[PDB]
Amino acid sequence: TGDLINTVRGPIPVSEAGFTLTHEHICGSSAGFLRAWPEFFGSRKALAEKAVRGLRHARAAGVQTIVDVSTFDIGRDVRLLAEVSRAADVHIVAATGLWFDPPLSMRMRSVEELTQFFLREIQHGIEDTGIRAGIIKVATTGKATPFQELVLKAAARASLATGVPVTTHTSASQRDGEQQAAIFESEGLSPSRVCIGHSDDTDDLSYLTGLAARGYLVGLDRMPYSAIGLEGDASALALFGTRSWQTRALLIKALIDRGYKDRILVSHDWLFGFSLAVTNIMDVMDRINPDGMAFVPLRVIPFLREKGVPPETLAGVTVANPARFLSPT
Amino acid sequence: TGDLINTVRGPIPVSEAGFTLTHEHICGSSAGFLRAWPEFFGSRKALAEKAVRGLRHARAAGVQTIVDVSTFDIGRDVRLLAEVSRAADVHIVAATGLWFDPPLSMRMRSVEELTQFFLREIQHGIEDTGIRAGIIKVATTGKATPFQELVLKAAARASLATGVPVTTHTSASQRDGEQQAAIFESEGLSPSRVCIGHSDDTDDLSYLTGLAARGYLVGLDRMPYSAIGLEGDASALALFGTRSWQTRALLIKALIDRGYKDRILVSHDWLFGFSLAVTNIMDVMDRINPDGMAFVPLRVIPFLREKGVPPETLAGVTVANPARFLSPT
Numbered sequence: 001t002g003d004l005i006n007t008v009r010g011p012i013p014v015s016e017a018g019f020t021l022t023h024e025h026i027c028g029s030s031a032g033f034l035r036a037w038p039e040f041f042g043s044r045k046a047l048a049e050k051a052v053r054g055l056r057h058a059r060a061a062g063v064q065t066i067v068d069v070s071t072f073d074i075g076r077d078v079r080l081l082a083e084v085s086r087a088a089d090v091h092i093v094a095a096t097g098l099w100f101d102p103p104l105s106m107r108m109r110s111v112e113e114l115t116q117f118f119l120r121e122i123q124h125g126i127e128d129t130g131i132r133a134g135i136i137k138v139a140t141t142g143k144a145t146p147f148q149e150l151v152l153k154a155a156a157r158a159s160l161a162t163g164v165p166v167t168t169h170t171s172a173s174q175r176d177g178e179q180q181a182a183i184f185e186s187e188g189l190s191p192s193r194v195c196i197g198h199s200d201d202t203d204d205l206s207y208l209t210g211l212a213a214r215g216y217l218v219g220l221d222r223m224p225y226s227a228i229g230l231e232g233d234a235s236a237l238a239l240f241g242t243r244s245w246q247t248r249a250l251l252i253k254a255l256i257d258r259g260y261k262d263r264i265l266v267s268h269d270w271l272f273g274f275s276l277a278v279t280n281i282m283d284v285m286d287r288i289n290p291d292g293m294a295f296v297p298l299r300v301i302p303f304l305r306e307k308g309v310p311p312e313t314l315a316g317v318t319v320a321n322p323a324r325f326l327s328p329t
Numbered sequence: 330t331g332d333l334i335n336t337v338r339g340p341i342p343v344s345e346a347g348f349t350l351t352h353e354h355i356c357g358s359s360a361g362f363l364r365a366w367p368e369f370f371g372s373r374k375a376l377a378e379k380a381v382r383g384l385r386h387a388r389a390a391g392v393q394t395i396v397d398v399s400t401f402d403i404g405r406d407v408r409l410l411a412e413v414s415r416a417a418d419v420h421i422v423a424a425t426g427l428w429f430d431p432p433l434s435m436r437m438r439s440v441e442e443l444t445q446f447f448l449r450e451i452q453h454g455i456e457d458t459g460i461r462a463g464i465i466k467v468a469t470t471g472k473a474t475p476f477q478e479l480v481l482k483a484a485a486r487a488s489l490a491t492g493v494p495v496t497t498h499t500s501a502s503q504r505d506g507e508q509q510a511a512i513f514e515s516e517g518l519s520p521s522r523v524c525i526g527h528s529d530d531t532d533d534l535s536y537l538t539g540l541a542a543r544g545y546l547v548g549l550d551r552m553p554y555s556a557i558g559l560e561g562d563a564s565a566l567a568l569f570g571t572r573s574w575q576t577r578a579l580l581i582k583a584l585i586d587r588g589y590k591d592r593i594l595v596s597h598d599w600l601f602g603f604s605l606a607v608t609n610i611m612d613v614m615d616r617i618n619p620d621g622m623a624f625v626p627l628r629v630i631p632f633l634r635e636k637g638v639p640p641e642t643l644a645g646v647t648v649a650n651p652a653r654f655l656s657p658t
């Protein structure tokens with residue numbers, strides 16, 4: 001009681017977040033793209049209706065909150081989010097930060113300037129909205145570019161000032177979390193404020209447990225992503241991998257087994273629109289996982305339960321861990 | 330009489346364009362940047378006031394029209410343009426196309442899809458505005474990337490369908506215009522519909538005359554850009570060059586001398602806001618050329634006149650050539 005998190009619809013008690021998906025997207029896009037070329041998505045109205053149907057479905061499966069980790073460079077549209085949230089009756093936490101597609105106007109900025117930009121989105125609001133970010137997203141793909149280091153640092157500085165957490169994109173098989181951790185630690189950020197994302201993209205428990213031992217949250221956030229039985233499509237193969245959802249799901253159990261149940265964050269990394277990819281890739285995705293953001297409660301939790309993970313443990317993972325992570329600290 | 334060009338304020342007779350700067354910017358930015366972080370520019374209001382003061386000044390010097398060649402990826406804000414145009418009483422033609430900073434949502438698109446995007450901006454309007462583009466901007470920096478080839482082709486296809494002209498960014502010293510020309514010609518575009526930009530960045534008349542002989546318009550569009558007496562600042566040196574404005578201006582005379590007066594387009598490539606660059610670079614620019622978009626009528630035309638270029642020739646360059654270029658053909 002009495003700790004608050006900013007949502008697209010305004011503030012809520014942390015205790016009201018409930019079953020929370022911590023790495024999600026309404027639309028995966030680019031800044032200004034949705035405004036410029038709505039027809040790409042059929043229409044803006046079509047995209048919203050699809051997101052509402054999707055989020056209604058998640059909600060029926062027990063999801064009460066999602067964190068949309070779309071940054072300015074993922075084409076985050078806070079008005080869209082608010083609209084869909086209201087319609088679906090699902091809370092959405094918005095993000096600041098930057099992903100690996102920053103435009104030059106961002107790439108030319110100093111660490112100080114980036115810090116002011118993240119803070120503005122957190123403390124003041126996004127664009128002219130008044131809608132405040134509840135999280136900061138950052139990214140690497142392998143070893144950090146020099147700009148990427150500035151971003152990670154600005155992210156840490158913003159976090160220290162606000163108590164808002166940081167979440168990351170990684171190339172998991174390259175073990176990016178180790179560098180990201182060092183940089184965050186250099187800025188003095190507590191690891192408990194940090195989630196190392198896409199960690200389910202690897203089965204290297206040495207890497208994962210090492211992070212969890214330091215106190216980092218480990219994001220097992222691409223649960224539905226598999227290219228199996230779609231070995232034809234090269235684009236899909238790179239995007240989705242050859243590991244099954246079950247293989248990915250087992251990692252949650254593996255961590256719990258190693259004593260790290262408190263350090264786990266679980267998600268889909270789903271979206272309802274996808275311009276960042278070739279045009280077919282939305283539909284291919286919907287064929288593979290028609291349950292969308294319902295997948296984790298429908299398929300993952302029962303699988304874990306059948307494997308012996310206790311229901312209270314499952315609750316701690318899906319409710320307590322997000323609540324603790326989100327709570328400005 | 331009776332040929333029309335689309336402006337941000339609506340259609341105008343071609344004959345009303347008058348003294349026209351064909352390669353300009355209100356703001357050089359990135360998609361959504363101005364919406365997200367207006368404080369970068371002091372405020373949106375500050376940026377507009379500066380643009381109005383600048384364009385008032387140009388107007389007093391005789392400029393009646395400018396073509397803002399800012400694309401979606403240069404952070405073109407058509408509402409801003411309309412506002413400033415109205416206030417300054419200077420016509421602004423808006424652009425479609427893409428520059429060399431396209432986001433992934435664009436980079437993932439097919440040639441067909443790009444063609445539909447350019448056409449939408451031309452035939453329907455930009456964003457939800459109803460404001461139609463009067464020109465298509467495209468770019469290379471050296472030899473074309475494969476995506477850049479698709480863009481050039483989509484640009485040609487849109488042009489053929491509309492009669493709207495194409496203008497380019499080049500790495501002039503690498504002679505990009507020759508490749509760009511070949512691609513446009515492959516798509517069947519007339520060279521008279523095309524301007525090969527930043528051609529004043531080189532003194533290679535062999536390259537320039539070769540283009541002019543084929544019927545291309547040659548854009549001598551960075552007239553005020555010189556780093557001389559600023560040999561300290563490395564950033565400026567790359568951006569502005571070591572050639573004087575006079576050296577750049579002489580090229581106009583050189584072309585006229587070679588019989589190509591009808592093939593010349595003249596400009597500044599100025600802007601009033603600049604996020605695409607490091608933070609100081611706006612102010613450095615304003616110190617060098619306080620006249621802004623007035624520079625060409627103030628300094629360039631008189632220099633040419635003093636060198637013997639006839640006033641009627643100067644008129645043909647600054648009025649007739651733009652009119653002919655802009656007129657949907």
Ligand SMILES: CCOP(O)(=S)OCC
Pocket residue numbers: 025027028029074169239269271276
């Ligand atoms: C395939 C989904 O990948 P991301 O989390 S990097 O974001 C793109 C929206």
Ligand SMILES: CCOP(O)(=S)OCC
Pocket residue numbers: 354356357358403498568598600605
């Ligand atoms: C220095 C001005 O360069 P550009 O024409 S490439 O556009 C940036 C606005």
Ligand SMILES: [Fe+2]
Pocket residue numbers: 023024025069269
């Ligand atoms: Fe994501």
Ligand SMILES: [Fe+2]
Pocket residue numbers: 352353354398598
């Ligand atoms: Fe330009």
